[PDB]
PDB file of C-alpha atoms and ligand atoms in Angstrom:
ATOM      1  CA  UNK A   1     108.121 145.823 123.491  1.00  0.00           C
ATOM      2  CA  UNK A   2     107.666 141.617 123.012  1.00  0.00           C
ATOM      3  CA  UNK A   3     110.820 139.641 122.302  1.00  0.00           C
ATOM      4  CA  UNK A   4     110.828 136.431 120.059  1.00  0.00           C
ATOM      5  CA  UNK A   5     110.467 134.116 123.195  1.00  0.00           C
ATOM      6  CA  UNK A   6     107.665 136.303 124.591  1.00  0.00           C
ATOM      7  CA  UNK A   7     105.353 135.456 121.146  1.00  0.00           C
ATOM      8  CA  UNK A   8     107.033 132.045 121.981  1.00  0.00           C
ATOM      9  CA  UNK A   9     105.412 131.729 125.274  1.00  0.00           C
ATOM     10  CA  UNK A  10     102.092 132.735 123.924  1.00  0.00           C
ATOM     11  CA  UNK A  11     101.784 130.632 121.133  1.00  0.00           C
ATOM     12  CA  UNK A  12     102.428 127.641 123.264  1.00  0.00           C
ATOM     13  CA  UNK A  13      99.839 128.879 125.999  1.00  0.00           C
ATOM     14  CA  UNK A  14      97.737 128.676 123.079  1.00  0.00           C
ATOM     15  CA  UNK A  15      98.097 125.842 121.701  1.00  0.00           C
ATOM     16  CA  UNK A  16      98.165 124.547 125.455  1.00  0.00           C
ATOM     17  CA  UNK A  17      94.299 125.804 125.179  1.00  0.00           C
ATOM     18  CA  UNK A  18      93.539 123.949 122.059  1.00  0.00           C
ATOM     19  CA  UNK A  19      95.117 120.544 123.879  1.00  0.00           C
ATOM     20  CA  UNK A  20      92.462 120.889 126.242  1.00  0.00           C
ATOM     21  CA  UNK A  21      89.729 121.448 123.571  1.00  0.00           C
ATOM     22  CA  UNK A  22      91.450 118.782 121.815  1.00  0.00           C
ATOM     23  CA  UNK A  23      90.886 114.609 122.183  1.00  0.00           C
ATOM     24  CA  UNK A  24      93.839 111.650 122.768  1.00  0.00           C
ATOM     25  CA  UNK A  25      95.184 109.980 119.965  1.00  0.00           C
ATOM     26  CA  UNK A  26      97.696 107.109 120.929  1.00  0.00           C
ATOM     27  CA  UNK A  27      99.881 106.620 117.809  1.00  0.00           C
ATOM     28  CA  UNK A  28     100.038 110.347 116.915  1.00  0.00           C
ATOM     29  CA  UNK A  29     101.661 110.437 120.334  1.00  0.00           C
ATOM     30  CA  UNK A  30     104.103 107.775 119.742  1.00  0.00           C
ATOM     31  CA  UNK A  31     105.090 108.991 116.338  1.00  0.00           C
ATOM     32  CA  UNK A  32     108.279 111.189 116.218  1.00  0.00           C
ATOM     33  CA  UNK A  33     107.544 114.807 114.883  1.00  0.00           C
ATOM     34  CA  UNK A  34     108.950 114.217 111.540  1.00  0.00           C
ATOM     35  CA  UNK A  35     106.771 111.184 111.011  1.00  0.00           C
ATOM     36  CA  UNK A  36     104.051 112.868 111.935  1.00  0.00           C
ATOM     37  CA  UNK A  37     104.693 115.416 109.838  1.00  0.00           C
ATOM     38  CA  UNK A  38     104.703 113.325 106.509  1.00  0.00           C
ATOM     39  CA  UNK A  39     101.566 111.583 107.662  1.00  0.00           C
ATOM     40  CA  UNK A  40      99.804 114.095 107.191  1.00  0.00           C
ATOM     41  CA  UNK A  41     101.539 114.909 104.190  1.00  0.00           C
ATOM     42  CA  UNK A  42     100.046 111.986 102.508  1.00  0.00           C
ATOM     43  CA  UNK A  43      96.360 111.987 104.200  1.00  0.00           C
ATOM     44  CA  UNK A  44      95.939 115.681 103.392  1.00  0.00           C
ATOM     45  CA  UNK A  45      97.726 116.160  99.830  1.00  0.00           C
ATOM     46  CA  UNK A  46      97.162 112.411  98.554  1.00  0.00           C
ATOM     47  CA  UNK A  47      99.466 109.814  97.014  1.00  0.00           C
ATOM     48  CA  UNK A  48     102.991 111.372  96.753  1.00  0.00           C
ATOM     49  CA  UNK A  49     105.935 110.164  94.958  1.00  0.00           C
ATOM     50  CA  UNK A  50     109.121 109.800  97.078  1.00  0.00           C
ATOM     51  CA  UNK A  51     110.788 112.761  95.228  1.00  0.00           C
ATOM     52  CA  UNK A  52     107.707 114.613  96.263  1.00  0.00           C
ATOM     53  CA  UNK A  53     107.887 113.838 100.052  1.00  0.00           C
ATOM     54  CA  UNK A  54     111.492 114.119  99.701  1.00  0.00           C
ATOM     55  CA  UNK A  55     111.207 117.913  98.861  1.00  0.00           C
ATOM     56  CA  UNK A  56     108.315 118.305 101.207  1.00  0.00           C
ATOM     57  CA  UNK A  57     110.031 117.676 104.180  1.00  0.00           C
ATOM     58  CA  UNK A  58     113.160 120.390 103.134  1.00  0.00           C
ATOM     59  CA  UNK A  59     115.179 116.709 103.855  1.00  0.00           C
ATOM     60  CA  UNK A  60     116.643 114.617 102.563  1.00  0.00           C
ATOM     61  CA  UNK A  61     116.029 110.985 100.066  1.00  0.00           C
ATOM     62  CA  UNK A  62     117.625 108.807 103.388  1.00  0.00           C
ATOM     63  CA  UNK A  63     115.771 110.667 105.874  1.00  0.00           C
ATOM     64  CA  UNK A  64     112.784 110.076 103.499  1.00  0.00           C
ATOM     65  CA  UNK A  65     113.377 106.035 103.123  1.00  0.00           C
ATOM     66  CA  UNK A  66     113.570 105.836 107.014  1.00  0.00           C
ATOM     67  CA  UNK A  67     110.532 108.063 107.929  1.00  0.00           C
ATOM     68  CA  UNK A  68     108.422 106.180 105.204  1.00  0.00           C
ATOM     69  CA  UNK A  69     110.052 102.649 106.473  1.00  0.00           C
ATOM     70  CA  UNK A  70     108.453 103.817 109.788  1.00  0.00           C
ATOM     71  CA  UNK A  71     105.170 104.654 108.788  1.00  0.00           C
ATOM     72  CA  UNK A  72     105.142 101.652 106.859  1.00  0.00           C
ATOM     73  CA  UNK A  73     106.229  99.497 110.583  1.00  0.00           C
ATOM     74  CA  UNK A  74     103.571 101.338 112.122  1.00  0.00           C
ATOM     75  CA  UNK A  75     100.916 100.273 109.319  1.00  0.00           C
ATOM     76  CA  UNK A  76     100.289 103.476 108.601  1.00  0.00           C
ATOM     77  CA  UNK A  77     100.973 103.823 105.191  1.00  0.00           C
ATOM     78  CA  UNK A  78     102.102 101.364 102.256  1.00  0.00           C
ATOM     79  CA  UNK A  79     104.804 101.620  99.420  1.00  0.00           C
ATOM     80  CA  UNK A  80     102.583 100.611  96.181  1.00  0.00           C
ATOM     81  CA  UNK A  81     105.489  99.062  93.840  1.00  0.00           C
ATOM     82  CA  UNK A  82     105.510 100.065  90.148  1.00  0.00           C
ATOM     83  CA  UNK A  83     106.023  96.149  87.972  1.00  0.00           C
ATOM     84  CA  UNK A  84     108.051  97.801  85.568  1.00  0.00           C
ATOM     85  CA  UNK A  85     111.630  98.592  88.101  1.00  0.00           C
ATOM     86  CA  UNK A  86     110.187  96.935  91.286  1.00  0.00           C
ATOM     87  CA  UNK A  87     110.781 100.661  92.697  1.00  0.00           C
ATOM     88  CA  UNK A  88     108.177 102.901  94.682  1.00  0.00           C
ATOM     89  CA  UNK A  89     105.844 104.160  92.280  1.00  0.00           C
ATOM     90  CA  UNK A  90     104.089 105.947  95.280  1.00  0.00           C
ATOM     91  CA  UNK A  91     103.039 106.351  99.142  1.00  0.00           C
ATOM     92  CA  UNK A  92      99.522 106.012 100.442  1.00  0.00           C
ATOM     93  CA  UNK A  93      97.920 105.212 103.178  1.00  0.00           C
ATOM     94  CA  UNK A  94      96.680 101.843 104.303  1.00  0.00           C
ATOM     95  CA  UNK A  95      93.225 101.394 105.794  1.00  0.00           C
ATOM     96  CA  UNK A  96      94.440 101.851 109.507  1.00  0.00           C
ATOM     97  CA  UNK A  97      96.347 104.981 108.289  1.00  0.00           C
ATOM     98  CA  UNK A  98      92.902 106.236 106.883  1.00  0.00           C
ATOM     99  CA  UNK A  99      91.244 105.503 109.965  1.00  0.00           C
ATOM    100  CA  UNK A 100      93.568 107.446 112.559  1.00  0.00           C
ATOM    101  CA  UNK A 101      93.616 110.035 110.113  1.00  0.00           C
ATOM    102  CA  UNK A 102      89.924 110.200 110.673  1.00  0.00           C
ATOM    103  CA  UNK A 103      90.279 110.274 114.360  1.00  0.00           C
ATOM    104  CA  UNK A 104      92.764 113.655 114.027  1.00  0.00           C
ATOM    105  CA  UNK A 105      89.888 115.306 111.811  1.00  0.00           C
ATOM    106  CA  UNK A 106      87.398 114.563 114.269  1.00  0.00           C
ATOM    107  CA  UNK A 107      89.098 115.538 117.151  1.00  0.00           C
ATOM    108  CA  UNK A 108      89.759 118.500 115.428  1.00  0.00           C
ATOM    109  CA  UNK A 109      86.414 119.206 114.248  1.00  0.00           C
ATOM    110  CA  UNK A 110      85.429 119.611 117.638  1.00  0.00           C
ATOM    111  CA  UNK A 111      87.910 121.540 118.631  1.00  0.00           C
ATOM    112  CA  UNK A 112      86.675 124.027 115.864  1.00  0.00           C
ATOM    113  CA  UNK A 113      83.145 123.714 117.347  1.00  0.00           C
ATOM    114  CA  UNK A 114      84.741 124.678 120.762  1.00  0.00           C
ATOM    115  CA  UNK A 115      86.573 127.603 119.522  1.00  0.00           C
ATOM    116  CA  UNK A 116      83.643 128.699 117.599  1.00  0.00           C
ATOM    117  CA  UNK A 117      81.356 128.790 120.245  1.00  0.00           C
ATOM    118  CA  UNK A 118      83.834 131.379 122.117  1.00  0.00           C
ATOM    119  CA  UNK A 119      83.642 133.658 119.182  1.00  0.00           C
ATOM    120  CA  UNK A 120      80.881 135.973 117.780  1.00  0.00           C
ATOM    121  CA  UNK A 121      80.207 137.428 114.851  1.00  0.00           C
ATOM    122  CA  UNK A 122      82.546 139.942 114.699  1.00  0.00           C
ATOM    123  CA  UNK A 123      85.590 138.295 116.630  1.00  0.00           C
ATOM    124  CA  UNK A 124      85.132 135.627 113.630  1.00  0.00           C
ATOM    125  CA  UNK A 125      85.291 138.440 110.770  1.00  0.00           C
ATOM    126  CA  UNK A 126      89.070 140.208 112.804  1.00  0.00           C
ATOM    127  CA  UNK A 127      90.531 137.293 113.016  1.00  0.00           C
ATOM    128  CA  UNK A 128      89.361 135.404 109.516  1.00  0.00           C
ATOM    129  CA  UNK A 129      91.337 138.706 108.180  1.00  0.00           C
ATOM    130  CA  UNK A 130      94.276 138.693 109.807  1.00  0.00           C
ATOM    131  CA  UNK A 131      94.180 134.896 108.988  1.00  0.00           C
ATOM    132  CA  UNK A 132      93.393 135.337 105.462  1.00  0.00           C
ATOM    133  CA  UNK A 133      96.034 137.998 104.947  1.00  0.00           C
ATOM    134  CA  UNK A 134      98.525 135.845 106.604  1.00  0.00           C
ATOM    135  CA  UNK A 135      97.779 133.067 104.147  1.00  0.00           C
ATOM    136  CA  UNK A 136      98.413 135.840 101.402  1.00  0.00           C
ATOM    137  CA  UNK A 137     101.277 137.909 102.424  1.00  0.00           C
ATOM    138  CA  UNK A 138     103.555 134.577 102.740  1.00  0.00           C
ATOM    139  CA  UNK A 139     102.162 133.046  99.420  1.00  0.00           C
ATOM    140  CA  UNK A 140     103.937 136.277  97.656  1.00  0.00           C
ATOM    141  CA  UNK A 141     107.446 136.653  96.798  1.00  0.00           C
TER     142      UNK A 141
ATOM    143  CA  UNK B   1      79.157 125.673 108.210  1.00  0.00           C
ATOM    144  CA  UNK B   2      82.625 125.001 107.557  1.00  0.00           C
ATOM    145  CA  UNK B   3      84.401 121.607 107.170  1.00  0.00           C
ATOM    146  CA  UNK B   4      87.170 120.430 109.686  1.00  0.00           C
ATOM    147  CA  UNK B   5      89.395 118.815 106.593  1.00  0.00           C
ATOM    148  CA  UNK B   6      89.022 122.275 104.504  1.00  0.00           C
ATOM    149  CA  UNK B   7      90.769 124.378 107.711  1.00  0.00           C
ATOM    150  CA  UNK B   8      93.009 121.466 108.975  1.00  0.00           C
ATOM    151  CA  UNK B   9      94.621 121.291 105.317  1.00  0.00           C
ATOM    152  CA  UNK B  10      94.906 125.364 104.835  1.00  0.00           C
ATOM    153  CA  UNK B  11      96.782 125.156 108.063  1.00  0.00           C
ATOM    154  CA  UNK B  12      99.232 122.333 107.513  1.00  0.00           C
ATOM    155  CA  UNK B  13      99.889 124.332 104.037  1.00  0.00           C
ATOM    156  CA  UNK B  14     100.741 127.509 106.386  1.00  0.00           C
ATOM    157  CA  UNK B  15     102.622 125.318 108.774  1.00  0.00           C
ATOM    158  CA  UNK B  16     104.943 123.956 105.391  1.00  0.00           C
ATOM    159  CA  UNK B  17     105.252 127.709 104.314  1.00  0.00           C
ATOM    160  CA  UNK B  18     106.753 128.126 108.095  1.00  0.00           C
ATOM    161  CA  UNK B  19     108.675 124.777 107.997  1.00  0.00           C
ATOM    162  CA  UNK B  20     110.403 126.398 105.027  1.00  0.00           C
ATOM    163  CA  UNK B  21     111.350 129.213 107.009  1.00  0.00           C
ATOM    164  CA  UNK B  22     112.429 128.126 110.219  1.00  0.00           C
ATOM    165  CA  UNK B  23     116.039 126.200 110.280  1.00  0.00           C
ATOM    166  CA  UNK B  24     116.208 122.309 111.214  1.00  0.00           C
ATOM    167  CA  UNK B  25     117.627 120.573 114.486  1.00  0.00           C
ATOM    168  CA  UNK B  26     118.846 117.063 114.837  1.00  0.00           C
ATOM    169  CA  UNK B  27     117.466 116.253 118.640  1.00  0.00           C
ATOM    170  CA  UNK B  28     114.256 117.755 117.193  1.00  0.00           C
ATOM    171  CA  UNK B  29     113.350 115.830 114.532  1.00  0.00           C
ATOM    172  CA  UNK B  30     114.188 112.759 116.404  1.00  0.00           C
ATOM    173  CA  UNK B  31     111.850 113.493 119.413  1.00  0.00           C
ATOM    174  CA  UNK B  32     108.789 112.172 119.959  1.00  0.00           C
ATOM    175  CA  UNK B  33     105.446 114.424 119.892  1.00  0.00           C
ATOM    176  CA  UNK B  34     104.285 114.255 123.503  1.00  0.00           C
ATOM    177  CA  UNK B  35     108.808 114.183 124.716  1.00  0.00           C
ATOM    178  CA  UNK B  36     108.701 117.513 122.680  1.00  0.00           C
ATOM    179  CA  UNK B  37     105.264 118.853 124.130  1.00  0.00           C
ATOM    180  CA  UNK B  38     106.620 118.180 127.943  1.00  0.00           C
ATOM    181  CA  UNK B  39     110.649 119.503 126.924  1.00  0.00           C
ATOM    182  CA  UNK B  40     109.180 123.181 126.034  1.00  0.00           C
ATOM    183  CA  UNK B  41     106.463 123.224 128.864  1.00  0.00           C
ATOM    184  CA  UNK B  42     110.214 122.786 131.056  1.00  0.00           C
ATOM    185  CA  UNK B  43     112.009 124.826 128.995  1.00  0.00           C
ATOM    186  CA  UNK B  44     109.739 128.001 128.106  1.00  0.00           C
ATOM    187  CA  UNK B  45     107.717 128.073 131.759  1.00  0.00           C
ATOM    188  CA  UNK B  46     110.335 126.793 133.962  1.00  0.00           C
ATOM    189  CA  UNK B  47     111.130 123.665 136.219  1.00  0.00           C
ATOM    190  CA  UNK B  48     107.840 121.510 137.460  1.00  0.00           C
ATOM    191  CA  UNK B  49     106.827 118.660 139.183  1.00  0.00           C
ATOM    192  CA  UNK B  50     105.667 115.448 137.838  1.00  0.00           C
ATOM    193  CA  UNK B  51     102.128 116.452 138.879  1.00  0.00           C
ATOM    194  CA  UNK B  52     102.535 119.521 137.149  1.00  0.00           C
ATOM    195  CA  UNK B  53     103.682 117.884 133.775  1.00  0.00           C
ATOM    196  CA  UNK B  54     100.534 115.209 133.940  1.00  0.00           C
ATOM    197  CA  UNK B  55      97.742 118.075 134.573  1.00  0.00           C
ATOM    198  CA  UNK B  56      99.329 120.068 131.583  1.00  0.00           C
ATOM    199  CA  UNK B  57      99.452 116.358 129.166  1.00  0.00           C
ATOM    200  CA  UNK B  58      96.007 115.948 130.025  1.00  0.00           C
ATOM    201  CA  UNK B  59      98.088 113.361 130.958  1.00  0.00           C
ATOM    202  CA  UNK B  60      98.580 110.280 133.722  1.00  0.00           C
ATOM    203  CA  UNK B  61     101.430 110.133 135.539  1.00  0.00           C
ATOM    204  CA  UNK B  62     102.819 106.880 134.449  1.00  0.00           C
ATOM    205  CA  UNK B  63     102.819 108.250 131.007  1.00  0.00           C
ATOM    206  CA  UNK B  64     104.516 111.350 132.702  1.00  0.00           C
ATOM    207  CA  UNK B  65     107.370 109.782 133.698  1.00  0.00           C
ATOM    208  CA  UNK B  66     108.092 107.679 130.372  1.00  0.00           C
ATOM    209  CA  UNK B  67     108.257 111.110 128.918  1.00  0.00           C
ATOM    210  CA  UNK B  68     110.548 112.696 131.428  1.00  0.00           C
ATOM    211  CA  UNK B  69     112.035 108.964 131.661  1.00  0.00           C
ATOM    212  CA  UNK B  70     112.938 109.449 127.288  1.00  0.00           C
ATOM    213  CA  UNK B  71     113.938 113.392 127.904  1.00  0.00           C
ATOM    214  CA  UNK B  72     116.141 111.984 130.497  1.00  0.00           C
ATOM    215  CA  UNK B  73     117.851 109.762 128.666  1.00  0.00           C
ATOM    216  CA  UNK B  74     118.438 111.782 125.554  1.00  0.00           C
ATOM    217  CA  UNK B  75     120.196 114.377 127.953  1.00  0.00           C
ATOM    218  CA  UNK B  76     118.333 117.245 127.712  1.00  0.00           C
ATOM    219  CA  UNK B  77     116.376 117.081 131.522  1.00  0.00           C
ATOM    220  CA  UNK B  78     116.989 116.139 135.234  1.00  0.00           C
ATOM    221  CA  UNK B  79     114.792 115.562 138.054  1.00  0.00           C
ATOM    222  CA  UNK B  80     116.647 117.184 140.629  1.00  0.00           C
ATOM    223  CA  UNK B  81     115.281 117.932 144.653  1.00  0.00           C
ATOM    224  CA  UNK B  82     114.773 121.208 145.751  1.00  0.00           C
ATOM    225  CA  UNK B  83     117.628 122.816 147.052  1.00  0.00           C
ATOM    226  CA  UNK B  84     116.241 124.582 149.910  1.00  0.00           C
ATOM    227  CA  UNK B  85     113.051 122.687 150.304  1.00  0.00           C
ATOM    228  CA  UNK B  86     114.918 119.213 150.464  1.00  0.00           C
ATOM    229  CA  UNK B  87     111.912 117.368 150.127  1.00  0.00           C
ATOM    230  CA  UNK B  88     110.213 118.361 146.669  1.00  0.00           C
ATOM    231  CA  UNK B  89     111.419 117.417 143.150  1.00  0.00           C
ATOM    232  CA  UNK B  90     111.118 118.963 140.196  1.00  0.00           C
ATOM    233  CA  UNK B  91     112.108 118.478 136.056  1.00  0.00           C
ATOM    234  CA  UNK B  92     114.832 120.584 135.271  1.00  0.00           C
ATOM    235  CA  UNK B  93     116.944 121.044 131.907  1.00  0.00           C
ATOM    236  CA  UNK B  94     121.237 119.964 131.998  1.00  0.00           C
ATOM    237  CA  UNK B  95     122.653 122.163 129.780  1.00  0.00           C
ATOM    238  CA  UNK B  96     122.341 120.629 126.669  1.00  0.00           C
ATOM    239  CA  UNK B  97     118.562 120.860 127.484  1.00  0.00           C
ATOM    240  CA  UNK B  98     119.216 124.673 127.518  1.00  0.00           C
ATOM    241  CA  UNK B  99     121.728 125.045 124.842  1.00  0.00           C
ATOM    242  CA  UNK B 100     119.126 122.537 122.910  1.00  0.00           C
ATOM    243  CA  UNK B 101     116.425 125.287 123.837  1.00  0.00           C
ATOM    244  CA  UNK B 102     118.996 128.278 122.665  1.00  0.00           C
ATOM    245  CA  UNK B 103     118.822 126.562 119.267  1.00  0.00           C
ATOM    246  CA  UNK B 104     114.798 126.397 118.936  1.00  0.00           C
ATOM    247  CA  UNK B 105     114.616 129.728 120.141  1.00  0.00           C
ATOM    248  CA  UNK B 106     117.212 131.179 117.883  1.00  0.00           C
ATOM    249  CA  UNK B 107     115.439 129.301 114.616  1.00  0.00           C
ATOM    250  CA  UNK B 108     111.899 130.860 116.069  1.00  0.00           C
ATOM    251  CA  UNK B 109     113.435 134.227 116.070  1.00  0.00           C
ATOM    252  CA  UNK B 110     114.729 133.401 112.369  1.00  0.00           C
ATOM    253  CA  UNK B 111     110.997 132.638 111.178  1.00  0.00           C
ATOM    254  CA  UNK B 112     109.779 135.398 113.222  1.00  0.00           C
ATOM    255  CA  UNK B 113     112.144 137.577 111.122  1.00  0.00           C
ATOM    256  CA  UNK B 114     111.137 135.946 107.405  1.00  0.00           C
ATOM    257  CA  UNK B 115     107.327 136.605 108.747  1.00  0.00           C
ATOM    258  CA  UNK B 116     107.868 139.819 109.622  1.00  0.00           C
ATOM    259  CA  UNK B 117     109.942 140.886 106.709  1.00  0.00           C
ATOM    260  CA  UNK B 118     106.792 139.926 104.256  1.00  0.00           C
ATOM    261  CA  UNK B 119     104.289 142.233 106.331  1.00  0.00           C
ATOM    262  CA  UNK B 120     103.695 145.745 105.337  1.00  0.00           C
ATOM    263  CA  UNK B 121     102.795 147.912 107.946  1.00  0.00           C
ATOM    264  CA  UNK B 122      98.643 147.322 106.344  1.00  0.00           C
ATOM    265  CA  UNK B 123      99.383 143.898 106.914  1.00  0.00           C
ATOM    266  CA  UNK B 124     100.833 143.589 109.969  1.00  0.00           C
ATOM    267  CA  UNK B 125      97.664 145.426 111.749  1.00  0.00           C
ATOM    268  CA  UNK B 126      95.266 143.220 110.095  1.00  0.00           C
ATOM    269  CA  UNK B 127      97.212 140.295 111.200  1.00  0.00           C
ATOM    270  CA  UNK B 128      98.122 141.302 114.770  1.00  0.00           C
ATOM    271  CA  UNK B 129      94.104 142.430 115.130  1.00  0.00           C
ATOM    272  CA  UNK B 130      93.215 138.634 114.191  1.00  0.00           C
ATOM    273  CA  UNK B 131      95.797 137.082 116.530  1.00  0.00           C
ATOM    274  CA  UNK B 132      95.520 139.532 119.442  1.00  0.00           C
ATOM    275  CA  UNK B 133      91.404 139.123 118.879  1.00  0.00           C
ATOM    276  CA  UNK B 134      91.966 135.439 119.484  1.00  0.00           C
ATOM    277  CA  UNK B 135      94.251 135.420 122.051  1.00  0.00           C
ATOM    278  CA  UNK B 136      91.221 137.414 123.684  1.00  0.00           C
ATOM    279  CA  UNK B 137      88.530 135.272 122.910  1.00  0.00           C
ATOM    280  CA  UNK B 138      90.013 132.231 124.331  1.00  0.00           C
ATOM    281  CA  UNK B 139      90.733 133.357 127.713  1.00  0.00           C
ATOM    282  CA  UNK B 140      87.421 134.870 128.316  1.00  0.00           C
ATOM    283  CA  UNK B 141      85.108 132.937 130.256  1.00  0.00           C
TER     284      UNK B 141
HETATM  285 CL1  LIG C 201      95.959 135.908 112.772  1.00  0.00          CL
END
């Protein structure tokens, strides 16, 4: 019997774990959630139109100008302009964005070595499954 | 072998497929990372002191109380003495914290449900293997 805030508790306990496998980054821990969020958008999926990142973030095309405008602050990313309209032909990141991003995958890296290290053979096979069939049971409907 | 970016990109994916499913929350998406990391520590595991906060942020505690400091001011958290003790403080949520905290825990119930919904009964042991297998293997040693 495990209520909502009981898997709640444990996922956090968790990912309390993987903070302490996990490095300091200083402007991933000043950025708000959403920012964040649509960082990574960019660093992991590429360029992306401004209709594209606002769909991505299930929000809206103001709360897209002012999350971009703050990336942009933060040097973190740059509007490229198309001549034609002087509009935004698309977000990517600037060479300081690239950079921190790099810091996150290393960090992370090594938190995957950590991990790995606690896990043998056969605890990596269970839960690569479960993973795996995660990743396909919500890709359905 | 596997490479960090391959995982870290698979997961953010997953993480979008929940962000889909989960509803939104104004004081949320306006919260900083580390503010939001320190509010649920309070909220999920009860009331702490500052020293408690900074050894869970792998954290200093001048960076501990600019946390608590923002929390504070956005309303959702107190530092209030002990009433019995007299003489020991801890972080505590008003009651917007908590009805803030009723809100996050009734959209994680929500996802929960939209999960669960797409699991067969075959999926849902596969799954529940991988995650209870993990859970496992990182609080062995
Ligand atoms: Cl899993």
């Amino acid at each position: 019997h495990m209520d909502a805030l009981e898997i709640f508790k444990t996922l956090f306990s968790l990912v309390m774990r993987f903070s302490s496998y996990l490095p300091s980054n200083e402007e991933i821990s000043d950025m708000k959630t959403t920012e964040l969020y649509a960082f990574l958008y960019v660093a992991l999926f590429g360029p992306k139109k401004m209709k594209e990142i606002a769909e991505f973030l299930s929000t809206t095309k103001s709360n897209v100008t002012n999350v971009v405008d703050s990336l942009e602050k933060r040097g973190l990313v740059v509007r490229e302009m198309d001549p034609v309209d002087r509009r935004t032909y698309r977000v990517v990141l600037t060479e300081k964005g690239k950079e921190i991003f790099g810091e996150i995958l290393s960090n992370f890296e090594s938190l995957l070595k950590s991990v790995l290290e606690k896990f043998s053979e056969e605890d990596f096979k269970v839960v690569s499954e479960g993973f795996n069939r995660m990743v396909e049971a919500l890709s359905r409907e």
